[PDB]
Design a protein around this ligand. Sequence first.
Ligand code: THP
Ligand code: CA
Length: 129
Amino acid sequence: LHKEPATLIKAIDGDTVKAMYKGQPMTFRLLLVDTPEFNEKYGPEASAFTKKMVENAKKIEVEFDKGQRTDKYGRGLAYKYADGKMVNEALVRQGLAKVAYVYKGNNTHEQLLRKAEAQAKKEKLNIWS
Ligand SMILES: Cc1cn([C@H]2C[C@H](OP(=O)(O)O)[C@@H](COP(=O)(O)O)O2)c(=O)[nH]c1=O
Ligand SMILES: [Ca+2]
């Protein structure tokens, strides 16, 4: 996979971030994760975690997988990186997202994220507490 440039527009919630990509605004939905909705337990905590990560970064990048790049809502499906650190993985490692929506052909980083989830679960963090 390849990292491409994006510029933060707005963090939306734990797993969606609006960013300028090839000069157009796109809402990105993070691949292979599911954060709680803001109205749900750990929802505000996930939202804040992603918000801090992307806002504090000198740069953000998006990395598409091999399969679908857009979902049925027109959201970009990507791995998002904040100064080279993957947001998707960080959320899972902190127990603020479950590995989820793992579709064949768009699951390059599944094992990375499963390993993170196992570690979060062992530490009883957040959703696993
Ligand atoms: C992460 C992801 C979500 N989606 C779709 C499936 C779900 O459809 P449904 O809306 O019908 O439940 C929805 C979940 O996104 P959210 O967790 O943001 O609600 O987004 C994909 O199609 N591909 C993806 O890779
Ligand atoms: Ca969600």
